[PDB]
Write a protein that binds this ligand. Structure first.
Ligand SMILES: CCCCCCCCCCC
Ligand SMILES: C[N+](C)(C)CCOP(=O)(O)O
Ligand SMILES: CC(C)C[C@H](N)C(=O)O
Ligand code: NA
Ligand code: NA
Length: 502
């Protein structure tokens, strides 16, 4: 089995897995919609009672399966629990990262195309009216991804966007095809430091933004000022947990797969804690200090919150660049922004394709080259659905990146810490650890976490079950049908692997 070359490389690889579009796009929006500081408390709690324990659990399962030559859940679940249904459940550790990868890589290609156009300097040129400043950039984005005028089911992506998507796929492939140590680790050691530097620079530049309408400092205060009136709002807790899952790459089967390449004897405790911590630093300190403080700086708090509620891509791809365009060297600043986004995105995407690749290698005994090329083929092909179908992206992000990750986190935790046994699991986690997990967490993993997740899922289901059946748009039914198809496909591949074993 292939292994990480150095501990540093491992850390930066995992951190590259975690740190991504979720930090600089999803987070600012989530925190803004949820009332700034009010969102932080639950967030932190969700980080302590969910993110950390599940992170350690996934590292442990990953290394455990890796020792035996298995980096994916279909096999690992079976090692931990002997059942066919364990394999069937294991299918989600493929389906989820694949589905998420499909749209994620596309958004990444967006960040790339924008990076290029802003570098070369082809951008809308604004003239004191907010709508006259934002409108050009809204039209810019809409022309890029081909957004319809009314609400219409069909998207018309520009040729440039498509070509850039091809290029992005090519970069992902060029990285993944060199393997764990050579392809992924090498790139991590560069992309990560680059990312941190760019992020710091942007944070500082943004912090200097002050106008008659407000300041970046106002945004920082808004984000860091506690509000206890929202603590009774379940939605805030749900959003916090969802964000924790998404940003730490939990429930995507990615962490597990990366961990399967960690040598049996190497420490997963301090490495894991370090990766998670790095992610949170990149999220709250970096991600939260860029978009929001700038928006608040120019338009004030209320307007910034309104913009955040407007959409996830509205703050990142429209508002921010429009704000930069009003400053000296704003185009170049926009470029830096989109380049940062692109590197974070890439470092995540490779991580979410790796599970499929690793299944093809381990279970079907395919060579790395073939596994990578076929994974790329599948992702690229499926991506046309997200490209040409309006609202498809949201559907995938919902079923896979929202519900699926929580369900799968609960499932993996239940299999590892309950069925496989709690003491054996604990010992497996602490084994080889440079430092040891605080005893209290044993009780957090076994009782608190699973209960919390179960409650969450119950609430969610309660709310969504009625809504699902009545939904008007056909695009979503097409998407659902297709991803169900993907699930059947993966299940079939698992069947084939199982048969090959015998
Ligand atoms: C090997 C390490 C390379 C580090 C390069 C950092 C470049 C930062 C540019 C903003
Ligand atoms: C009954 N079941 C389908 C849930 C489990 C069967 O697993 P197995 O005994 O065939 O391995
Ligand atoms: C799906 C995951 C790889 C996403 C990543 N953790 C992020 O924060 O963007
Ligand atoms: Na993240
Ligand atoms: Na990343």
């Amino acid at each position: 089995r292939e292994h990480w070359a150095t501990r540093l490389g491992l850390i930066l690889a995992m951190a590259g897995n975690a740190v991504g579009l979720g930090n600089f796009l999803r987070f600012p929006v989530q925190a803004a919609e949820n009332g700034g500081g009010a969102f932080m408390i639950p967030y932190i709690i969700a980080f302590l009672l969910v993110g950390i324990p599940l992170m350690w659990i996934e590292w442990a399962m990953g290394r455990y399966g890796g020792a035996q030559g298995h980096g994916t859940t279909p096999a690992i679940f079976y090692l931990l629990w002997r059942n066919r249904f364990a394999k069937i459940l294991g299918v989600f550790g493929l389906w989820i990262p694949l589905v998420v990868a499909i749209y994620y890589v596309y958004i990444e290609s967006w960040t790339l195309g924008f990076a290029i156009k802003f570098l070369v300097g082809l951008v809308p040129e604004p003239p004191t009216d907010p709508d006259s400043i934002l409108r050009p950039f809204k039209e810019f984005l809409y022309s890029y991804i081909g957004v319809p005028k009314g609400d219409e089911p069909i998207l018309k992506p520009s040729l440039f966007a498509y070509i850039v998507f091809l290029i992005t796929m090519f970069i992902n492939v060029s990285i993944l095809i060199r393997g764990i140590s050579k392809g992924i680790e090498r790139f991590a050691k560069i992309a990560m430091p680059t990312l941190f530097i760019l992020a710091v620079f942007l944070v500082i530049r943004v912090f200097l933004l002050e106008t008659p309408n407000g300041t970046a400092a106002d945004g920082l205060n808004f984000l860091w000022t506690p509000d206890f009136e929202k603590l009774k709002d379940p939605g805030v807790w749900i959003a916090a947990v969802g964000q924790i899952f998404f940003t730490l790459s939990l429930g995507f089967g990615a962490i597990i797969t990366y961990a399967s390449y960690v040598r049996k004897d190497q420490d997963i405790v301090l490495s894991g804690l370090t990766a998670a911590t790095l992610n949170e630093k990149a999220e709250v300190i970096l991600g939260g200090s860029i978009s929001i403080p700038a928006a608040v700086a120019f338009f004030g708090v209320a307007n910034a919150v309104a913009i955040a509620k407007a959409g996830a891509f509205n703050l990142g791809f429209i508002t921010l660049p429009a704000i930069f365009s009003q400053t000296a060297g704003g185009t170049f600043l926009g470029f830096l922004w989109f380049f940062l986004l692109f590197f974070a995105g890439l470092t995540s995407s490779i991580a979410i394709m790796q599970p499929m690749i690793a299944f093809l290698e381990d279970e079907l005994k395919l060579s790395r080259k073939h596994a990578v090329l076929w994974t790329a083929a599948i992702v690229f092909f499926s991506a046309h659905l997200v490209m040409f179908l309006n609202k498809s992206l949201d559907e995938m992000d919902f079923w896979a990146g929202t519900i699926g990750v929580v369900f799968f986190g609960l499932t993996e935790l239940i299999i590892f810490f309950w069925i496989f046994g709690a003491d054996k699991a604990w010992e497996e986690i602490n084994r080889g650890g440079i430092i040891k997990v605080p005893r209290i967490y044993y009780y957090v993993m076994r009782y608190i976490t699973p209960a919390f997740l179960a409650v969450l899922l119950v609430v969610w289901a309660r709310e969504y079950i009625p809504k699902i059946m009545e939904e008007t748009h056909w695009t979503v039914w097409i998407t659902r049908f297709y991803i169900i198809g993907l699930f059947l496909f993966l299940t079939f591949l698992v069947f084939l692997a199982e048969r090959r074993r015998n």
